[PDB]
Design a binder for this molecule. Structure first.
Ligand SMILES: Nc1ncnc2c1ncn2[C@@H]1O[C@H](COP(=O)(O)OP(=O)(O)OP(=O)(O)O)[C@@H](O)[C@H]1O
Ligand SMILES: Nc1ncnc2c1ncn2[C@@H]1O[C@H](COP(=O)(O)OP(=O)(O)O)[C@@H](O)[C@H]1O
Ligand SMILES: [Mg+2]
Ligand SMILES: [Mg+2]
Lengths: 477, 466, 187, 456, 128
């Protein structure tokens, strides 16, 4: 038979030229006799080019290749939550089979103009710097960009952990299901990350798709789309999903490899001509659906690694032109101890200021103004400006794996920009903050609760905050 | 004529017709699809086989699938019944409001206007932006191109020009979204709905929208620019109106040509683009022009890959534009906005016989002082500021003041900035720069000019500085 | 699918189709039959009518192969020959047909053991010494071979004789001798 | 399976089989040669033809020469009997000491451990070297980029790491000489024989050597790293140890990969490296990790081409480096040995959540006081001189007498464990020893011996 | 025509970079082997057999002449590209224009340092 079965003419360069399959469709998942799977990429007048999703070593010439009749898809559903799957949706955590009952095509298209609606709901990252100056809303694509070892994966992990305070509540309109796609990272890194999430008890609502560095380049090229489909499932059912592609530079590298072994004309930095469409067709699927489609959304946090802080490279500028903002993680800031090393001068969120809560906006518009002044100065008043700015940057520094609720953050920024720290020693601010937090978590649960429920800061709550911070400040060093 | 599919390479389909080989640029339909799939003929490979660019996704195609010739290029509905709608590249309405009940259809491929039809009128177009109007003023009917890397402010600038020009406009207006963010299209649709320009309940809409965005395969991104051109061409020729045409982004047309050209079996030219880059851009950009039968004022955003302003695509586009505004990242990172580069933007009407000797002298003085400051940059950076001549310190201070003043807050940028958008008339700009050149404000701090309106607000702020 | 390779190999598309037919025939034992029918169809496809129709680059591939089927089926072709014909036609490899046939002939020129050898001398030779030379250069051969003598005459070698048998090559001409003299006396 | 050579182009040999094609990455023995020549399969060209790269020179290969398939990738002999011996890319002893009488072999092409076998917590590897265990600790199972070249005591640091890991953790080491100068290979061999690391007379040798020299076809120089990694993988899995795997150099591994690619005709990537650069490095480095049996800790000498860290080869090997040990020459001229630069040597486990808040605090304090000492020395008071004194004592205390050099200076060997290093530097920073002379810390083990020497 | 009928002409190609780009497209589509910047191998021939037609005949051929002023657009002042260096090596001297001099008030922005006229003083009136 030469219509539902083929013979491998020549395997090499990660491509299998297969003879037969007169009934195969473009982008159809064929199955090699070795147990492997592949995608029917090229359909030529005599042979079929098949991308192999694995090691070419497992394939010889003459091996029979069956067809599955289904375009490349992944298993989706709630059954994936708490599972570590690979780019093909296969459990690699040894916890049995994925009990999914529906599948979704990885190569779908993004929703058009009408099914969308402007971003309106907050996506609390739990990080003071992000939530205050770079607000991210559900349905946005915010780019985490920066050099190697600057704190990108840590930001993503803090976000996924922070979502825990919502995913245990009642209203299904605030819960957020997270997905972390790993593209070419060391596998030990992903194992340790999965453990870190298991300890914080954030696996019960997270999926981890891992196409690590030892996986074939087609797996690293497909993994983002498996993740985005697992997220589109939640998006199309009125639910909310966050997804982190960590990172897109390594998927771009894998695609460049796949393109050069196919002998396609390399462009700038030897990248293929369509290295932009590669990421655009993927980051466009993170959308906010209107109510006539479910109200669901999908938030994407693509990570990008720059070389020597160079942001005007090829792939960084591509993703900057695709996403709705960025978060610059400088390395000189990371060296001086500032962590998270967010360059709040260059970081931006175009569609986030409409996603802040009222209270966070009340304190953060201010804080942004004073930080802008402090940055543009670096007299008698400018000394005050510099001092307030130094205090505020010292307030933005944060620990790790400890994201703060929105009410705690607005309380801290309130205590900061209301002048109440303009006399303390900068190097002590941090500790003050810590101590302060404990106090407010002990003796002011009702104030935090009403700031939360109201989502705003009323004048009664403002006066309570002022009196509370002054009482604590007087009883301090 | 009925052919069959013999090769499927990504977005390029080779189909073998038995008899009745369709000419080049014809549209073919693929039989057996849930949604319409149009293939445009690009080559004749011999053996009665033709190569085609698909206009949508090509997954699920199987070798041997039937294909029907339509016998004509991709025809889109044109007319006043297209205003307030949203059509994709092949002309289907994608706004979910029913079909476009217009009378006639036009083909998206057409010949450029001849030489005798070209008009040479060069009235100025006051946008209200200080740097644009001072250094690179636009012209009615001219072609405007906003260059700039990723994240420097092209889209905000186009939204500002839509707010300042497409609202006080008399004729019609077209917006062609060629490979850009879809959420930007949704936001533009709703912002135009609320502002009364698009009227969904009656037939008084003043804008037609075409959209093939960055989620579309390269065929759609390559031809949606031509679709928008076709709509604007109808509104110009067949009604003699005064049309505006906002294209964003036009670099994606060339980039899509490059994405498909590898598979069309062609030797890559320099960088990696198609060998036919310049002529493709020419046959597209020559249709976008004001004839003597109408007028098309065009504003085209132009991406710049890796900020390389010598990349073949923008370096080829430069020759097609009447006025260029080159946003720069080195300036946006100074906090200045808009990030226009005052030393790289040019215009064909910056001529003393057009904008008046006064405007010309002011513009040239601003450019000269900024160029002198740019020359001093390295000395100032290494050998300190207080090692300069007194005249040199004067020029440095004045040039920094002018740098700040050239910035201006936008009405559409008040969502993530808070400041109030200003609209500086031409006279106020000329006067303010006359005064700053003359040193009439060497006592205020330069910080007073950052992000203000006219010079009155500058001195008002400078007083508020104390 | 395992293929049996001929003892001599030809390359290019000619050689590929030649060895394809060699394997296809040695798997049903029709070597001489397909060989003679190949030579005859080569003669057929070189008469000016069809030899001119076959290479017209516009005649449709389907109609061309159908007409070619019409033409070959009348000579009572065994299935293998017309199979190769249709395989060449539906692949557009018809202008090469004769070449393939040529190649195939050479393949049989090795199956029968035919060793082609050349003995080039100054002047033409009489067949008494030519026959004793056939005997001489036949003594080299192993068990079970036949030999094809293709002798040419060139006075440029001024005498002697050159025996190029397959790959072996002895140069007993006076020319290489006097070149040896020149090079040895000069050195 | 028996095929025949149909084409020879330099180091690329096309071999045709009649039946039973060998899978990719298999080893083929070329029949009828004086010395063994192994071809490694790289492609399946069609018509039952495979393309291969040769592990040794291809002089004297004739079209049609027989070739035997081995049914498995390049299988090297592994086991404790490898210790002290030297072997080439295919496991033949090149030390002229007879065969490597081991009990089992192993293919050099294996897969990285499964996700369920990884170790979930990073833990420090105690090397007994004060500066390394304080300022730039070595993660157990991580890759360490060892910078610096000649005249800074690099090979002494290598032998001392071997010795310390063998004594404290009981795990052997492997030295893969990827693209080594043969002169330097022999020099290192003899230095290892002297310092007791290698022992040509008994069964107590610590390191196993694997050499692929500068004068081998690029296939050999590309696969020698996998050979060394296979020896170390045996020591980790079947013995359950904490292995060290020295790779010198790694940039020559990348270069061999690039050459192998260019020979096979693949289009070059950016700069000039192979299109599969990141994937080559990944499939190599993802085997050096910790499992539920043991671990493998790799120390890789990094060469930076044209002193450019944004070059694709350093930029790609950096993604796998968990630490860094910079040997400066200025620190060597100052009499400090090991000459590890204290400030430039970084790490990725210098994190309180990992090394504990105590260790992190002591190390951060040492780094801070050394940085302040440099900033003060920029000028050349009240307590600035106190910091200067403490910093001079810190610099002196960073040095350490290596056991592998006992034969030279007679000084004993000091394997300072982590607790005593932490406590000593804690006491030096707390000012407890502000009165001792600064020379009382030069070349000392724990702080106890520092005060003992301070007595004299 | 004018050159051969005793009259004097002056031709201005504006510019030659675009003619070279057109020829490069025709070549790459004709599958001719590309060279530097994917230009064909004989683009120098293309510009030289054109710029050589600009001669000054003697009085046995009417005395007419033909002056050429080819124009060339460089990318960021890179006069070491392929087509710029070809046309520079062909012609009899250049007129370099810069943008730094153009915005320093010097218009026409002729950089006198790099501009040369291999004909020189023989192409001037006595007074000038
Ligand atoms: N806010 C922080 N506070 C304390 N430590 C931090 C903070 N952020 C990062 N770190 C530490 O600095 C290191 C940064 O590594 P991290 O994975 O978070 O960033 P990365 O960009 O993903 O690095 P890589 O390029 O290797 O993936 C981590 O070891 C982390 O523990
Ligand atoms: N007039 C402006 N004022 C302040 N910020 C601006 C202004 N214009 C652009 N920006 C900045 O640029 C970002 C978006 O610019 P945009 O036009 O969308 O980039 P692109 O060229 O990719 O389309 C904004 O988030 C903002 O940070
Ligand atoms: Mg990471
Ligand atoms: Mg844009």
């Amino acid at each position: 038979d030469l219509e539902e079965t083929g013979r491998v003419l020549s395997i090499g360069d990660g491509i299998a030229r297969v003879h037969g399959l007169r009934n195969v469709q473009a982008e159809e998942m064929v199955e090699f006799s070795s147990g492997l799977k592949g995608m029917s990429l090229n359909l030529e007048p005599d042979n079929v080019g098949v991308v192999v999703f694995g090691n070419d070593k497992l394939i010889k010439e003459g091996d029979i290749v069956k067809r599955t009749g289904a375009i490349v898809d992944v298993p989706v559903g709630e059954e994936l939550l708490g599972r570590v799957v690979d780019a093909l949706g296969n459990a690699i955590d040894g916890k049995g089979p994925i009990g999914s009952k529906t599948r979704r095509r990885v190569g779908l298209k993004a929703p058009g103009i009408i099914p969308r609606i402007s971003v309106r709901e907050p996506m609390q990252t739990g990080i003071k710097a992000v939530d205050s100056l770079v607000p991210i809303g559900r349905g946005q694509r915010e780019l985490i960009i920066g050099d190697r070892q600057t704190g990108k994966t840590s930001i993503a992990i803090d976000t996924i952990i922070n979502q825990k305070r919502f995913n245990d509540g009642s209203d299904e309109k605030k819960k957020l299901y997270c997905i972390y796609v790993a593209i070419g990272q060391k596998r030990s890194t992903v194992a340790q990350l999965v453990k870190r999430l298991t300890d914080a008890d954030a696996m019960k609502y997270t999926i981890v798709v891992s196409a690590t560095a030892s996986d074939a380049a087609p797996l690293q090229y497909l993994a983002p789309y498996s993740g985005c489909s697992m997220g589109e499932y939640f998006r199309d059912n009125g639910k909310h999903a966050l997804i982190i592609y960590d990172d897109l530079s390594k998927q771009a590298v894998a695609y460049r490899q796949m393109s050069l072994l196919l002998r396609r004309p390399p462009g700038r930095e030897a990248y293929p001509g369509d290295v932009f469409y590669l990421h655009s067709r993927l980051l466009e699927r993170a959308a906010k659906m209107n109510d006539a489609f479910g109200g669901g959304s999908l938030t994407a946090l693509p990570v990008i690694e720059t070389q020597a802080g160079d942001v005007s490279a090829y792939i960084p500028t591509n993703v900057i032109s695709i996403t709705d903002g960025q978060i610059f993680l400088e390395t000189e800031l990371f060296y001086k101890g500032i962590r998270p090393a967010i360059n709040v001068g260059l970081s931006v969120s175009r569609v986030g200021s409409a996603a802040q809560t009222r209270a966070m906006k009340q304190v953060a518009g201010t804080m942004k103004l004073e930080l802008a002044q402090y940055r543009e100065v670096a007299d008698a008043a400018t000394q005050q400006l510099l001092s307030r700015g130094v205090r505020l940057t010292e307030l933005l520094k944060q620990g790790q794996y400890s994201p703060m609720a929105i009410e705690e953050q607005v309380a801290v920024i309130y205590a900061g920009v209301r002048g109440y720290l303009d006399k303390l020693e900068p190097s002590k601010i941090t500790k003050f903050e810590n101590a302060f937090l404990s106090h407010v978590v002990s003796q002011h649960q009702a104030l935090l609760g009403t700031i939360r429920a109201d989502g705003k800061i009323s004048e009664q709550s403002d006066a309570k905050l002022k009196e509370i911070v002054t009482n604590f400040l007087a009883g301090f060093e | 004529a009925t052919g069959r599919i013999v090769a499927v390479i990504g977005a390029v389909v080779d189909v073998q017709f038995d008899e009745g080989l369709p000419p080049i640029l014809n549209a073919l339909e693929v039989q057996g699809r849930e949604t319409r799939l149009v293939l445009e003929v690009a080559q004749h490979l011999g053996e009665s086989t033709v190569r085609t660019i698909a206009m949508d996704g090509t997954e699920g195609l199987v070798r041997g699938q039937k294909v029907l010739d339509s016998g004509a290029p991709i025809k889109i509905p044109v007319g006043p019944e297209t205003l307030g709608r949203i059509m994709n590249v092949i002309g289907e309405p994608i706004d979910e409001r029913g079909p476009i009940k217009t009378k006639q259809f036009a083909p998206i491929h057409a010949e450029a206007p001849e030489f005798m039809e070209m008009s040479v009128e060069q009235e100025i177009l006051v946008t209200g932006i200080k740097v644009v109007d001072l250094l690179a003023p636009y012209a009615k009917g001219g072609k405007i191109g906003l260059f700039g890397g990723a994240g420097v402010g092209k889209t905000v600038l186009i939204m500002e020009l839509i707010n300042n020009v497409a609202k006080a406009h008399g004729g019609y207006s077209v917006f062609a979204g060629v490979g850009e963010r879809t959420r930007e299209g949704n936001d533009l649709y709703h912002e135009m709905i609320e502002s009364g320009v698009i009227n969904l309940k009656d037939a008084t809409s003043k804008v037609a929208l075409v959209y093939g965005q960055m989620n579309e395969p390269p065929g759609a991104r390559a031809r949606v620019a031509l679709t928008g051109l076709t709509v604007a061409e109808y509104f110009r020729d067949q009604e003699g109106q005064d049309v505006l045409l906002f294209i964003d982004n036009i670099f994606r047309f060339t980039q899509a040509g490059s994405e498909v050209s590898a598979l069309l079996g062609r030797i890559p030219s320099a960088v990696g683009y198609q060998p036919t880059l310049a002529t493709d851009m020419g046959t597209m950009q020559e249709r976008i022009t004001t004839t003597k039968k109408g007028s098309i004022t065009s504003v085209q955003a132009i991406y710049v890959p890796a900020d390389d302003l010598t990349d073949p695509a923008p370096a080829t586009t430069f020759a097609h534009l009447d006025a260029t505004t080159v946003l720069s990242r080195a300036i946006a990172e100074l906090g200045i906005y808009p990030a226009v580069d005052p030393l790289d933007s040019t215009s064909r009407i910056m001529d003393p016989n057009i904008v008046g000797s006064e405007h010309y002298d002011v513009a040239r003085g601003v450019q000269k002082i900024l160029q002198d400051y740019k020359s001093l940059q390295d000395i100032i950076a290494i050998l300190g500021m207080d090692e300069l001549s007194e005249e040199d310190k004067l020029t440095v201070s004045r040039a920094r003041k002018i740098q700040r003043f050239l910035s201006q807050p936008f009405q559409v940028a008040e969502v993530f900035t808070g400041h109030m958008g200003k609209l500086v008339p031409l006279k106020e700009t000329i006067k303010g720069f006359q005064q700053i050149l003359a040193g009439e404000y060497d006592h205020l701090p330069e910080q007073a000019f950052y992000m203000v309106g006219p010079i009155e607000e500058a001195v008002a702020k400078a007083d508020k500085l104390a | 699918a395992k293929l049996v390779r001929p003892p001599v190999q030809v390359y290019g598309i000619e050689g590929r189709y030649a060895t394809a037919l060699y394997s296809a025939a040695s798997k049903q034992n029709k070597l001489e039959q397909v060989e003679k029918e190949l030579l005859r169809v080569a003669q057929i496809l070189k008469e000016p009518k069809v030899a001119a129709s076959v290479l017209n680059p516009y005649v449709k591939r389907s109609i061309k192969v159908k007409s070619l089927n019409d033409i070959t089926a009348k000579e009572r072709f065994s299935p293998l020959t017309t199979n190769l014909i249709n395989l060449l036609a539906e692949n557009g490899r018809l202008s090469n047909t004769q070449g393939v046939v040529s190649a195939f002939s050479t393949m049989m020129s090795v199956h029968r053991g035919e060793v082609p050898c050349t003995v080039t001398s100054a002047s033409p030779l009489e067949e008494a010494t030519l026959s004793e030379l056939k005997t001489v250069l036949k003594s080299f051969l192993s068990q079970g071979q036949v030999l094809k003598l293709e002798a040419k005459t060139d006075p440029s070698i001024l005498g002697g004789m050159i025996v190029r048998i397959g790959e072996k090559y002895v140069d007993m001409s006076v020319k290489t001798k006097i070149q040896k003299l020149g090079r040895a006396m000069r050195e």
